[PDB]
Structures are given as C-alpha cells and as structure tokens.
Amino acid sequence: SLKETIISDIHCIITKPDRHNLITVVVETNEGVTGFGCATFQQRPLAVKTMVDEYLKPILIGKNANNIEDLWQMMMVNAYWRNGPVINNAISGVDMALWDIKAKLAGMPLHQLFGGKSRDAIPVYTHATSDTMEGIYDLVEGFLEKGYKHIRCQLGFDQDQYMDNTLTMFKSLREKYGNQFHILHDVHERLFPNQAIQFAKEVEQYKPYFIEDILPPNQTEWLDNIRSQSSVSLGLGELFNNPEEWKSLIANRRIDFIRCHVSQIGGITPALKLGHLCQNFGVRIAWHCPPDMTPIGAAVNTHLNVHLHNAAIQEHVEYNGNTHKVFPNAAEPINGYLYASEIAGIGVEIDREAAAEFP
Amino acid sequence: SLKETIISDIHCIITKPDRHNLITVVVETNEGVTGFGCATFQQRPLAVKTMVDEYLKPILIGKNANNIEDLWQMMMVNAYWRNGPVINNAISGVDMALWDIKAKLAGMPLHQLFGGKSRDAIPVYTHATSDTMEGIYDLVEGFLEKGYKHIRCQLGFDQDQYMDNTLTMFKSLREKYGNQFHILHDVHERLFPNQAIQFAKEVEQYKPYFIEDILPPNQTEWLDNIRSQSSVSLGLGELFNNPEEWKSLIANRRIDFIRCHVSQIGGITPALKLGHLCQNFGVRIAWHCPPDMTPIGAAVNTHLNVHLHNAAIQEHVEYNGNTHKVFPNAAEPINGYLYASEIAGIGVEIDREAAAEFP
Amino acid sequence: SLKETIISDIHCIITKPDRHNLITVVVETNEGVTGFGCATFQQRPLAVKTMVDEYLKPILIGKNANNIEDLWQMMMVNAYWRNGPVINNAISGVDMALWDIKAKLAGMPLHQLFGGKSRDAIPVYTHATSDTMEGIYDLVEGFLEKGYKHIRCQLGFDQDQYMDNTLTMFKSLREKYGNQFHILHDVHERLFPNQAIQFAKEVEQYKPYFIEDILPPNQTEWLDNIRSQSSVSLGLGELFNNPEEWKSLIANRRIDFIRCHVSQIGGITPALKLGHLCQNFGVRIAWHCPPDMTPIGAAVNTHLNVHLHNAAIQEHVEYNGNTHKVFPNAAEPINGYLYASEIAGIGVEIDREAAAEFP
Amino acid sequence: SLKETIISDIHCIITKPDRHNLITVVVETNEGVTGFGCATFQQRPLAVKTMVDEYLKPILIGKNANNIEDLWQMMMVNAYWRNGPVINNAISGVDMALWDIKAKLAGMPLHQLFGGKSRDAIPVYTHATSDTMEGIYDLVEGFLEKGYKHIRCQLGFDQDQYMDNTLTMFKSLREKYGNQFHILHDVHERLFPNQAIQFAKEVEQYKPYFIEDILPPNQTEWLDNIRSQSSVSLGLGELFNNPEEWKSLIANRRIDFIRCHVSQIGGITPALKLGHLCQNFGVRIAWHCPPDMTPIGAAVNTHLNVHLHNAAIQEHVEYNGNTHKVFPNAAEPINGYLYASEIAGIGVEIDREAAAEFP
Ligand code: NA
Ligand code: NA
Fold first, then answer.
1. Sign (positive/negative) of CA torsion D57, D62, D63, D64?
2. Protein residues with C-beta less than 5 angstroms from the ion ligand 2
C-alpha cells in the first residue's frame, strides 16, 4: 500500500560553518517527503555539485524513488565511464537521500528499515596526533577521561626515522597505559614494501587495533608476504572507489578491517552488500568518517554500524556550534559510544536558512 | 517513531488441502500486528512443529520483533548444535514472520522494505517429466501455449541408460523446438564423478539452462575437473542447510546458479546475504520452490526475486482450489512471469478456519 | 552361517537420573538379540525421539539388521533433506544398536568385531573450570591425585580480557606444574579471526595439547593464516554434522585433532571411515563425550578408541549413582585410562525398570 | 566373551595345479581354529615362502591373533626397511588368515564381520586379447553369451602402430556392438607422456570403462595435463606396494579407479582403509585378480567387493579342475556376477592332500 514516490527536485547545498566545505544533497518528491544525503569531497566541493546539478538531476526528475537499487545501477553506469571520487560522491548523496525517503515512508529509523539492530551502539575512536610523546600523552588522557577506549595515535603528523619513532610511540604507550585502550595507527603509504613487512613484524608485539595503509597503494600483492609472517591486524580501503580495489583483498583474507568511506563507494546501497561480503569472509568494518563528513553522513554511518553484524567502530567527528546549528540533533559520543537516531528517517537534516549564513 | 514490537504468541499450523503437509508459522504481537512464515519439511512435518512449539516459542515470547537479525542469530545458536533441516526450517518460518511484521509496520510490500525492485517480475519454469519422448512433447507444448519459456525436462522420472536417454532427450528437444525454450535438467546425484564429467562434455552442445546436481553430494571438488573442460551451466544447493556447503563453491565460481531452498538455510535473513554474495561472485540465483511450499513461501520468493539483482527464475508451484482457499490471493504466473504482491507485508496469509477443514 | 537378522521393534527411551535427559535407542529382533545405542541432544530430547518413533521405525521394521551400512545409507537419505543434529542423532542410536547386535551375534567385544585393539586403553581428560586461579589449582590437583595427565582448563566459564586471562592461566599453570600434565583449552569461537591468529602465536610457547574452536564457525579458511605462523595444535569439529565441515579441513592438514561427536555425524559407521581418513592425513582423534552422553555412548567411544590407530584421548563423563543404576557396568577411569568392555556386544545396556524411576 | 586366540603354527604352501605357482599361507591356533590367506608372486614364489617361513613365523608364534591391526603394524615395520612385493605379499597372506580366523570365531561370512553387504554381488570383467579384430570378435561374443557386460580388449597382446590399432579396435567395437558392453583397455605404460595425452583425447569419444596404466610408472604428475583436457576414465595402481604411490593420486582426483592388488599392499587391513579413502575422494575400486591369485584370494576380493561402498568390478580368474580340486567351493561368475561366500569365514580353504599332487 505504498504508492509510487515521484522525484520532483534535487538540490546540492555546500556550506562552511567550520573548517570544511560540507555537501548535502536534497531529494524532494511530490508527496512532500524529503530526503537528505551526504557527499564529502573537500579538496573538490565544486566538481561534486556540478555532477549533481546538471548530470544527476536531469536523469532523476520524474522517477520513482521507491526503487533505490534500480536508480543506483542506472546512475552508476550513466556516464558510461564509471567509479571515481566525483561521480560516486554525487551518486552517494542521492542514494542516501533515497534511503532517507524510504525510511520516512516506513515511519522508521533507517537502521530498522535495514532489518534492525545487531548491537545497542557502536564504539568510537578519536585522534591523538602530536610531534612529541608529551603531546600525545596530554591528548590520550583527555580522551580516556571522556570514556574513549580506542585512539588513533600519530607521532609526527626519514622513513627510518618515522618507523623508529612510531615503534618508540607504541612502546612508550604500552609502558605508560598498558591495555587501558586500543591503539590505532595509519602508516599513510609512507613505506616501501620491504620496509612495510619489517615494520609489521616489529610492531606486532605492541598489538595495534589495526595498522592502516601499511603498503603503497597498488602493492596489495605484498600483503601475502606480511600475512605469512606477522599477526598484525591490517586496515585498508580509505581511498577506494572501485570494487576491483576490495574484491580480491577481502576474498583472500588480506586485511582485517575494511576502511572505505561510504560516500566514495557509492552510498548505502553498495555499503550493505560490502558489509555482508565482509561478514562472509571474516573481515570487520570501520568505515571512514573524515572531518568534512556532515552530521547527516555520520548519522548514516551509525545506522549502518548498529545494524551490520561485522561493524566494529566509528571514527569521531567534532562539530562546532555552527555545524550543530546547520544540522540540528546531530548525536555525540556518550562514554565512548555513538547511539543511532530513533526518529523516522536518517534523523538528521540540514537547516537551509542556517546553511545560508555560511557560504 | 517505531516503538518496540513485542512478541505475544507463536503458532505452527500444518494443513493438507492437497498432496502435501503445509506448515505455516504465525507470530502474533501486542500491537495485533501478525506475521506469517513458511516452513517446508513434508517427509517430516512433525519434527518442525515440535521445534517451533516448545523450543522456539519459549525463547521468543516477550521479545522485540523489530530486531530481526538479532533474533535470527540468537535462534540459530540456541540449541548449541546447529544447521540442519529441522532447526533451520523452524527458524525460517519465524524469520519470515518477523520480516512480514516489519513490512506491515512499514506499510509497504516486503520487497520495497528490502530496497525496491530490480525488475518488474521474475520468469517461471515448469516441470515436464514423462517415460517417453511423446509424453514430454505433450507436456512441453502445453507449457509453451501458456507462455512459459523455461521447462525442466526429465525423461524417466542403468546410469548408462539414463545418460544415453537424457542426451537423446536433449537432442530430440533441440531438433523439434530449437530455441523456443530453455531446457533445465536435474541429474539428482545419480552419476559417479567420472560419469559426471563425461555427461557434462556430451550435453554441452545442447546448451541446457543448467544441469542441477550433476555430482554425488560431497564430491564438489570434482567441479574443477568439469569447469576446466566444459562450458555447461551448473546448479547446486537444493539440499544445503549449512554455509560450509556453499561458501567455497561460490567463491571459486564452481557453479552458475545457486538452488538453495530459502527455508532450509534459515529464512530471508540469510537469503539476502547469500543473494549479495552471489552478485559479488557472478553466480545467478534460482531458489527452490517445491510442491509443499505454501503460497506464503512462494510470495516471499517472488519478493526476493524482483528485489535481488542476480535472481534469475522462480520454480512453479500449482495450487489446487483447496490451497487457494487456505491461502487467499496467492499469485499465479501470467505469460510465464510471477508478479510480486503490492499490498503491505508479504501479501499472503493463511485462513485459519479454512486450514481447519484440512487436517 | 549367520542367518538374516530381522528387526522386530524399535524404542527410544529418555531418562533423567541426573542433570541431563539421556536418550537410548533400542533395536529388538526376532532372534531376541537386542541392540542398544546412544543419541545425545539435551537441548532437544524430544525432536530426536519423534524422529526415531515415527520416521525411523517404519522404514526399519522387517529389515535385515545384518547389513549395517546398507541400512545406514538408506536412513541417511530417507528424508531427502539430510545432515543435521536431529536426524543424525536418531540414525546414530540405531546405527550403534545395529553394531551392538552384530557384536553379540559374533560373541565378541565390539572393538574385536572391528578388527581388534591398537592399544590396551585410552587416556582420559577431565575439566577444570573456575573463575580464579585458586579455583583452577584446587581442581587440577584433585585430578592429578587421581592419575589424570590431561586436563581442559578454562578460567572464567572483553574478548581482550578473556585472551589476557587465558594466557595468564597458561603461564601460571606452567610455572606451578611445569609438564606434570597436558593442558587443553576451548576458545568456544569467542574471537574474531585477527584475534584468533594473535592468540595462536601468543599461546604457542605454552604448548597446549590443543586449542579447540579458535575461529568463528564458518571461517576455517583463516586456518592457513594461523598454520603458516604458529605451531599451536588445533582441534575442531565439535558441532559438525556434515562431511563438508571436515573433508577439506583434514585433507589440507588444517587441524591436529578431530573433535566430532560420534552421534552428531551419524554413528559408528561414519566414525570408522573418518578415523581411517584421519590416519591417512596425520590427524589425531578426540571424539566429544559430553555430560549427556550415556554410559552406552561412552562404552562405544572406548571401543572406537582402543581400536582406531589415531585415537588419542577420551573425554571424561562423571555418572552419579542413579546413572550407574540405569546403565549397569559402566566403566570408570583407572589411573587416567578407560578400558574397553570385554563381554560380547557394546557391554553396556539400559535397565528399563530403573529408567522408569527417572522420567 | 572372546578369549585370546593364540597362534600355534604358520605354513606357506605353494602348488601348481595349472599354469601358475599358487601360494597359500596357513595360520593355525591352539583352539584349532585355522586361517587361510593368499599370496601372489608368480615370478618369485620362493622369495615369499622364505619370508613367511623364517621371518614372519618366529615373530608370530605365541601371539594373540585377535588383534589383527596390531599384528599388521608390527609385521610391516619388523624388517625396518619396508613396502615391497616380497614382504607385503608374505604379510598379506597372514593378514588374510587372521581375518579368516576372526570371521570363523564370529560364526559369520567375512563380509558380514566387516559390517555387511552394500550390494548383492559384484559384476565381473573378462579378457579378450587377440592379434586380429576377428579374434577379438570371436572372444567378445563368447563372453556376451555368458552374461558378461565388461570386457578388457587388447589388440595385439610402433608405439604409433599400437596407438593406431587400438583406436581402430575401439572404433570397430563400438560400430559392431555399440553399447552392449563396457570396454576396458590397459596401455601397460607403453607410451611417452606426450603420446599418453594425445591418446587420452583421441580415445575419449569411445568411452572406455577405463584406460589403465596410460603413463610411464613415475610420471603421474602428467595426469593433471590429461585431466584438464580429456574426460577419459583412468585406472592405476596395479604394481603399487607403497602408500606414497596412491595417496596424492587419490587426494587430487587424478584417477577414477584404483587397481591395486590386495596382496601387494599388505592385505585386507590396508584394503579396507584404502576403500574408505576412495569413497571420500570419489574414486571407484577395481582390485586386480591376476591368473595366479588362488580361489582364496578371489573369495576375499568378493567379500571386499560386496561390502565396500565404492567397489565397482572384479577381475575374472578361470580355475581348471585341478585348481577347483586343491581349493573346493570356489565360486564362479553367474550371469556376469560373483556372489560372496555365505558360510562362516572366508569360505574357501586349501585341500592340503590335493595340493600335494601338484608340487
Ligand atoms: Na611463516
Ligand atoms: Na581445458
């Protein structure tokens, strides 16, 4: 007894209440049921907006929003060339908006629409980056006081100096805090493969929650060398926009955490399927939630994270007063956990007037 | 703005309006929102009913029906020993009922709840089994007249005689009908592996839609021998109740169609994830719909089949007048296609009074 | 000069002399030669009994008990759907009873019928589970005093706390007792695969006899990661009911001990063949003997364990006075060893009157 | 209630009632229960007899015959060097005799002791060898008239001429007899691997029951080349005496029929386990029964062949009147099938007086 949901208009609002350009996609329908979605391309806000305004919107107006995957498949192949940061982001904002419409139509929280909760809340990790161990302590202790139990620690913001200081960082952190928290670290592709394998063996004893981006970006074939000699947990996927980047990685158990950005791989639609894939292959899920993701994206990740069986942790995003003003009711971690929204829909929208104040 | 959905009661109704014992699971809730699900174990109707009545129902009463996967995971591990025909069927009827409740709560067709249609309808295949080619012609032509374009053909209802007659069947069917329809065939595990490989090479030229169960049941390792020499399309999975039976099969591209029964693998919850898995690995989907599946199961398969990207075809089930009476509004193929129900929920229930007439 | 042995009746007696529902299957024959077998499904006693009473017994009455594997193959495929906890248990009680009849007919101990002893007795392991190291010491020392040389030790009856305490348990046990006994530990599938590999490397130095269930249940593919980096001995198979669960595991040397329950995989008939398979591939055998296995099952495991070349150890089961009363002559470990029965048959039966006292 | 069975004496009788030296091993016991076994080494009758007389018999006298595998393992490693034609044959005669004793003790047919029949009888194949097609027809038609449905056909008793004539033989046989019988062929290792692969592809269309010994004897690695391009069924194992010869062959599905001689691999004890192994891996069983196997060996193969699930066919052995005289009650094929003996024991012994007449 759901009737066709006809797409009447599409907007793409960029706003700068804080450090970053924030991109919201707005899908309006004849019923006056409105959907909101998040795109995130700060280095390139304008490319995304053009892609939505005069390429996505023409092929969407008039369409039945009810059939989300149909509309997904159609957008994804429309330019013929496909898979990249600009297109997937644009499509992801619409995909998210379509899911939002469906959940409002269903009168339910987005994660309930998916099928319900696997857990009550998702743990959160924060970022401690400093040039000195003193600075990292200062930051760690403040996060501890707030209930966080996972913290990404980066000492220093040549390759040998970085590897040496980082092992010293892991060593001092275990000496000072033992097992009070899990320690995450992103290598940011700074190592040659031989250096990567060496570092994986040396850092193993310190039991990182995961080491992210330990290899240069098209050298994943070197993972088998690492995984045959080290038990170190590994995350990859942050810059992926293309299934070829994650398919063999996961089928071959070459990583422990997938770290894709939901908007970079095309939205909720592909995120659910990749979530199920991860569960099949025993890989955990830690989607990125960067500084320029809006409270709308973050709310979507929390819905994903209480629903998907293999979701492990959500990445923290601050929000200043401006941002909370532009996106009302944006949840914040309580004792180190993010709670899914409980009203119908995504549960967070953008205040268009407020977003005006901040062009 | 969905509130807890509290499970108030659970029933398991068996009925014999026709050839088979039909098993319906009924989940009632405080809101008076009622869910219906299908279990199918004709050789063993009673085992399923005991499993539901005094093992499932105790651990379910009081629970929040909203969290379907939570309740799935819990039922699946509850007996500690797990995965088999009796338990998965029992759990599948409840799983299906929980999905039904959620879709009614959402005021939407079950497949809309999933995320919408990938296609308008799913094609249907029928069964032509006879002891003589004359009998098979007679049956094929009646199906053709009704718009069917896929037909499973079985000539004869020793191994060498069966292999010889079957190749003769494929050969005569192509001579008589050319490409007017797709031809399916189930080998039913009747061949030794060496005979299987020989038959796969010989039948290739006749281009079956798929050959089902070509190997003895724990000899899937012989598939690589077949797939390195023959292009014949292969289906397996009919008797699977255990992920170990399908995980390596699909990851290694050893089959072309998965043929599991949705109720044997535990319900809609695992069916969606296996559907996504099949899409990832390029394997198509043809769930079994046996003679003792009710119109409730069949309606669920059609919802699955218009929604999941890789769904290929639905297996036909007759329904006599009795059965239509016990389960009102059960769809029937139109010009060789089954159309998903469009009212809220699964769209088919059981008339409890009518089911009374047929114990 | 053996004549047909005609099956005249079949019973399934459940009894609760102690903690658990105990299930005995009884096969009677025209000659008045009676067989006894054990089914074990405590979470689900009733499902098994229904399966025996009105599904197994009809297809068995009149049949020639002499042809055990014929009757095995026939029961196993009879429901068409196959392999699960309820059916295999039911079939296993009958299979065991058929073997019992044959051994009485032969006037010999069951293990002699198989072909004789490989060893004089099988060692036994016991269970020390407590919340504190003090409690585990207390329990270990009592087992030591009784001659046991293998003990499964469980400290605590989050994942990080469990892994930490368990390594502390292994470490304190080696410090206190050195090599006075072998230490077994069941991880019970509580770890993610990355945590499993880490734990396997860390626990290696303490030389467990085996670590059981170290992975989540459908993640055995992660075993190669473990086995390429750690020498830790591994057991799996406790919940298996399906050859697909053990075939590739053993052929690829992915475990060191098979831990299936003889009743869950269908009886003595499949146990002998899996025993031979284990010998071929260099895998040792440690069938489960849970708290609800009867003295009849236990006697069968001891016959299996003195006969099969690769049998390594038998799991201990208590028996209170009630149980000994219901099943007379049930052997008990002497100086840490179980001795096979030496009278004709299995050597243990059920006292039907006594089983009456305890419904 | 079986008591120790004490070995009192051991004999090895050679006899030449026909073409071949026939070797029977005799195990006597204090109870006066006597066992008979078959060794077959015609090229070397005397080596076997020495091995039994003054190496086996000393380590056997006094021993408990009840524990067959214990005594097997002990004999097999006794010389320290192990596995070859002379030792395994000697040990096989004793192993067979020990099984014979056990079956008489049990008052049952040997195959009943094993666990019963899988089938009522085993089909038989015969040998048609001639230098001309006329000669092969003559022979085939006589076998057909007698009810045989499987015949090994050899045309000619250089490599290119042999390959050419053999394909011509297969072609003419299909033209003349179509599918009236199965056609077996032994290549006898006469081909280089490249010629083997070519022949396997060319002979495929004629559907041999199997092609035996298609490769030179230590070139089994070339099997993967064949099996990736041809469906031709393959048998190997005739000269095997060493598990290394069959273990990887079967685990990797590189053959379809195992063709070992039971006496060459050490007796019934290893034959049962290899039978179970074959079943696991989907390989069928066709033990050799050469012209110098006695009616005692043949009776043992028939017991093996009605019992083991994967047994496919038994090789024919004539017996002239002399031989029937030396070994009374030796079964003969009826309408192309051999029937297992139904009296207690193996069911065939040697008449020592009669064997006297024929030194
Ligand atoms: Na290694
Ligand atoms: Na090929």
1. positive
2. B 228-229; D 228-229
